[PDB]
Design a protein around this ligand. Structure first.
Ligand SMILES: CO[C@]1(C(=O)O)C[C@H](O)[C@@H](NC(C)=O)[C@H]([C@H](O)[C@H](O)CO)O1
Ligand SMILES: CO[C@]1(C(=O)O)C[C@H](O)[C@@H](NC(C)=O)[C@H]([C@H](O)[C@H](O)CO)O1
Ligand SMILES: CO[C@]1(C(=O)O)C[C@H](O)[C@@H](NC(C)=O)[C@H]([C@H](O)[C@H](O)CO)O1
Ligand code: NAG
Ligand code: NAG
Ligand code: NAG
Ligand code: NAG
Ligand code: NAG
Ligand code: NAG
Ligand code: NAG
Ligand code: NAG
Ligand code: NAG
Lengths: 314, 171, 314, 171, 314, 171
């Protein structure tokens, strides 16, 4: 009587501590390379922002009207998204983007500013709603009539709620000093914003800029988080795009950036711009910037784990 | 392997052995037959599956986006972010390579060891009634029919019962 | 004669590469979970800042008078600490906090500014020392009398020492433009600060802010490090809270943030907000933000290391 | 284990063996007795203690505070800081899990091997005067009193001195 | 017949999992400690900037005239390098430094600005080329004659190329308000810069600064990257150091900082300030800030890998 | 080691053995001689070289400068950068220490195992014609001249050919 072990005609080669390309009876892959090219969103409240830029949900350019109070577990930004209608940009935009991706959505509430002695209905042909309009959550404050003086004014808001308030305001930079006076009157203009943990001043800077959407004038959007029971007070003399509502974060979510479709029929937890990584494998070689609950990215495309003995055929 | 059985003093494996990882191939007057040993095979499968089950564990740690593919974040903080991620990548590629290399060494060595236990168990079953040929075979110094071979395989071989003859033949 | 090995009636289960929950004769923990809820400071010169905010030790609000020249190996910040008396905030405050935590303490030296044609004794009811006072290391420069003009002036300081000098100055933002003129005279006001490696300009921004300590006006504290043999020169026309002394770092230290008592009877090297981690174990599951010389934080609460053979009882 | 002794062909351990990790249990005409072997036991303890001493090494690298629990630092740099720390945490949790799993495998395997050396040493002490029963026992084919058993344990057993009788009994 | 193994009289001690200082027949080092004190640059187009500061290659102070259009695979900064001639500093200087280290060099192209009604030949005794001169790639715009008004003007540049354009401009801070008017006329001065993804305003800040190169006035150099087909437009009224050429990145390179000589006879891929690490070893204990393709830095100075059996001599 | 040969029941190594890692030292009527076994030696060298070849692999990942030695970068971002790098350093120092410790354990254990295979192979070559002395020697119970010793070493020893005499001497 003789003892022996099995072997097969065609095995699979693996690497060990002492030898590369040792043949074993069977092995299995540890590095995931297979991508499913869709955003697998089954079971998850999903918001596909589309042409709405994420920061736009706070200010409300026309492309974001359907997203002013969105609610979501998964947030998808698209390349065609725009935060603005009147050209401009947010200061510390990415920090704000990162805050909103994990927010779970936003809940709007009137901040309660009332005005006297000015126009409040500033509109532009860049934010069109069957006619000239503006950001839905803001108000473009102007002098009552052309070249009239904008009074120095102070408007305050108390966060009476239990979570921090997102307050956004804007600084208007006109196309020239002459255009800036026609909207707000001549002279240096200043907007001061202060809270219990914040202080910063702003003066508008009129000047020529390249035409974006037909305009050489621009708006700077600024923001702060107002703690519960804290007060934000705005002192301004013109060139101020005032907030109408404050934003409050709903809960928790995650944000991704994708160029692929939504699929409510696959379930996944690891996303990248090309789709979803669905895998029980501990490693992936697909995208080092994948987000969610993911296998660890590695540079190897393949790492074979022996699952059987050494193959020694005759 | 570390135990010099598999790919060792047993020169090769059996491609006709489709019913187990290890087994017995005996020859007597009725001819030769081959059957697999379940107990030894199942131990190896069980250990390798445990290895597999560790590696297919889902890790419940969330990472969120911290740079931007559509609007590149500021350059300096971006270089720090890319530098860190590449550093982490260097670490996990090392860990993956080493883990699989080490695990493969141990898997190969683990299969080698289980064979040696089967061989040595049987040797001690046969006691003084047989001698090892150095290739994994036991030359049996007594007549051993199919029931006798079957009795070694399921560990009911009584060495004493045949003791007088096997010894009677070795001198 | 028979060979054998020991076993016991109740062993401890551990995990291996091939099996989870294998029973061995004895095992020991590798992950530290036991916290001692105090700051173990035996053998270490400790400074508990208490109600003094760390940045306050440079400017010297009343709560920090005992800390103007502190010396320490271990620095403890408390939640009730305040950097300010007159409301305000530091620019790049955390960088400065991180500099001071590893400083080993500070040594003050007069920077030698002398003045003519102005008042130098600005005081406030927010920094009270048996009466209206101010930051002990600064001087609130004012016009000699209400609405008088503040002369444009330049004051320079040479670091004659062998280590970098910490220079702090302040920008005063009055409650309104009318209040700002009463202190310094009307018109745009400017403070320029320059060294061999630094250049930055500042203009005050009067305006309403929420009342903190009764005041709607605020002070911006700014700072720079002046290299040995280098000179800092201040050119200003008002709204300038001038430095009286420069600060020099004593040596080396470490800073923690805690809400627990000091214990000079336990010795430790790894601190977190809840106390001290005293352990020879390589891992801890207590606080991922622990500081000092620490076991590596891990998410597992327990990892049992086998210290004996497999237990096979009958 | 890899050596198929412990939890292997020796079916179980001795809960009455309180004086060592491994030992001998003999039976002769005066009855049976059990004593521990010091030399084999001390080797295992020494290897496991070295493992322990590596793991209780103090590491003299200082890390300082870089974010803030009382006044949260700016959000973006804070997300980078939290992202890095969570990445490092992921790495050390992996290293801790793997280290302990690997070390435990080797510790178990290490104890198994030392038993086999004790068994094989003794087998070669007894030479041709005994046969293995397959359960860790040596059936001694000559009369072996308490001094004789004690002589195997402290490695003073002279196989030749009893050679004629043990052989005289195996045939 | 007897079986045995070899041993030698003097072995080497190594560490294992179970024992420290076990003697084996031979072992080899895994941690590289040997440094070659030169920048091994064989086979690599090398640019040793020397007294030219890296940022200077964009503006062109005299020490950088030979580097205005350099091309390189390896860039070496030296401690004596200066980015400036007229004293000043770049904003976000390190980001720009990091951009230029991986650029492979720069290719200059005229941006095409033409002027009327002003002087364009501003010169200083700090940038001397056989006489008073200026930054070779910039133009110091002045009023035609002392105290004459600088007209508000707008100059635009279109990136007609296929890669981003590096545009640099400067803000001049005169020694005093009186000196600033002599160059550009009195009143507030403003420079606005805008593109498709950028907007920022600048006002000069005259004031006394310590004399660096004899001057108490300073220049702020600012920069942006202009995308292909995008336009940058400058609106300014004085105190503006205008760009004459835009810079374009050539390809790819790497930058190091060294205080050691160039050696075209050794070949290397891992550099630090003290030279080159040439090693096949996986670890090094030389410099944790080494750059290039390097062994991983470790704190151990030595880790011996056993390459032979245990040594048991008699 | 795990196999209790090297530094085990063979008490020590041979400093005069300059031609191999393992070998045979025989004694017969013409005297004693020592020669190395190539096959066993080359296996160990081959495994250790593979270990070495893994460790001398060049890694093609570039890292660039992200802070500044001549003009220190801003303090806060600098503390984050230094904190990360020190964290990465902590990780690679651990990996280096553990890798070498583990690799050294396996290298020592690997050499120990190959010796045991040589010993056991030869034992099975000699079959019933010799007995192990417990120190790595085989007492040969028949006259074995230099050609006979050479025949064991190059695996041409026919145990049967001498079977009658070796047995004739053991009883
Ligand atoms: C030149 O045009 C218009 C426009 O953009 O529609 C006319 C708008 O009525 C006017 N808006 C207001 C509130 O008066 C707008 C404005 O002059 C610029 O957008 C400001 O730069 O221009
Ligand atoms: C309204 O009050 C007081 C105060 O805070 O005590 C009076 C102080 O004398 C005055 N300080 C000086 C130096 O004149 C102070 C000051 O008007 C404000 O604090 C500035 O906003 O106010
Ligand atoms: C005081 O000196 C000089 C110099 O630096 O050479 C004279 C130069 O002609 C003048 N430059 C111009 C363009 O008029 C220069 C200038 O006044 C300062 O450098 C500005 O602060 O000064
Ligand atoms: C071999 O490998 C994989 C992974 O264990 C397994 O799923 C597969 O079914 C195995 N195949 C055979 C033929 O054993
Ligand atoms: C806010 O103030 C109200 C009283 O107006 C008080 O009841 C509440 O507890 C406060 N909440 C916080 C978070 O300060
Ligand atoms: C970071 O990496 C991405 C992808 O590797 C790259 O395209 C991007 O330019 C890098 N970020 C910066 C700021 O260079
Ligand atoms: C078992 O484990 C720990 C760690 O080695 C040790 O301190 C303890 O005393 C041991 N106990 C016994 C009963 O062996
Ligand atoms: C500073 O200048 C003095 C002369 O005034 C000189 O002796 C000293 O060495 C200098 N030190 C430094 C650090 O420059
Ligand atoms: C970083 O982590 C802490 C604790 O996990 C958390 O409370 C904090 O909000 C995080 N920082 C930021 C900026 O979100
Ligand atoms: C011992 O170690 C090194 C590394 O393997 C090798 O280069 C050297 O030549 C060896 N020397 C001997 C004498 O075996
Ligand atoms: C830029 O515009 C030209 C037409 O003027 C067009 O042919 C070219 O493709 C454009 N390139 C890019 C990168 O937009
Ligand atoms: C970072 O580390 C270097 C070298 O260890 C040190 O000299 C430098 O000061 C550190 N950076 C900061 C910003 O402290």
């Amino acid at each position: 009587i003789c003892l022996g072990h099995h072997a097969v005609s065609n095995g699979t080669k693996v690497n060990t501590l002492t030898e590369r390309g040792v043949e074993v009876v069977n092995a299995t892959e540890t590095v995931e390379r297979t991508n499913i090219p869709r955003i697998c969103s089954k079971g998850k409240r999903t918001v596909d922002l589309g042409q709405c830029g994420l920061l736009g949900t706070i200010t409300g350019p026309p492309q974001c009207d359907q997203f002013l109070e969105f609610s979501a577990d998964l947030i998808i930004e698209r390349r065609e998204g725009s935060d603005v209608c009147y050209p401009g940009k947010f200061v510390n935009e990415e920090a704000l983007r990162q805050i909103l991706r994990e927010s779970g959505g936003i809940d709007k509430e009137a901040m309660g500013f009332t005005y006297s002695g000015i126009r409040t209905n500033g509109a532009t042909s860049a934010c069109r709603r069957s006619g000239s309009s503006f950001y839905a959550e803001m108000k473009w404050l102007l002098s009552n009539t052309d070249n009239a003086a904008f009074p120095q004014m102070t408007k305050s808001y108390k966060n009476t709620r239990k979570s921090p308030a997102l307050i956004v305001w804007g600084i208007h930079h006109s196309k020239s000093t002459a255009e800036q006076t026609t909207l707000y009157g001549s002279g240096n203009k200043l907007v001061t914003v202060g809270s219990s943990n914040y202080q910063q001043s702003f003066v508008p800077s009129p000047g020529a800029r390249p035409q974006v959407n037909g305009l050489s004038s621009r708006i700077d959007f600024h923001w702060l988080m107002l703690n519960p029971n804290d007060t934000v007070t705005f002192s301004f003399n013109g060139a101020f795009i005032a907030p109408d509502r404050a934003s409050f974060l709903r809960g928790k979510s995650m944000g991704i950036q994708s160029g692929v479709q939504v699929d409510a029929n696959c379930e996944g937890d690891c996303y990248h711009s090309g789709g979803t990584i669905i895998s029980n494998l501990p490693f992936q070689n697909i995208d080092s910037r994948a987000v969610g609950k993911c296998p660890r990215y590695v540079k190897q495309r393949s790492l074979l784990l022996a699952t059987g003995m050494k193959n020694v055929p005759e | 392997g570390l135990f010099g059985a598999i790919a060792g003093f047993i020169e090769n494996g059996w491609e006709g052995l489709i019913d187990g990882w290890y087994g017995f191939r005996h020859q007597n007057a009725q001819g030769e037959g081959t059957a697999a040993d379940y107990k030894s095979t199942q131990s190896a499968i069980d250990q390798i599956t445990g290895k597999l089950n560790r590696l297919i564990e889902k890790t419940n740690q969330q990472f969120e986006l911290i740079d931007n593919e559509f609007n590149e974040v500021e350059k300096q903080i971006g270089n720090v972010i890319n530098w860190t991620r590449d550093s982490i990548t260097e670490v996990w590629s090392y860990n993956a390579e080493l883990l699989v290399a080490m695990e493969n060494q141990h898997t190969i060595d683990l299969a080698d060891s289980e064979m040696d236990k089967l061989y040595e168990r049987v040797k001690r079953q046969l006691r003084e009634n047989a001698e090892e040929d150095g290739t994994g075979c036991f030359e049996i110094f007594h007549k051993c029919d199919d029931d006798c071979m079957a009795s070694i395989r399921n560990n009911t071989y009584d060495h004493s019962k045949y003791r007088e003859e096997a010894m009677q033949n070795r001198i």
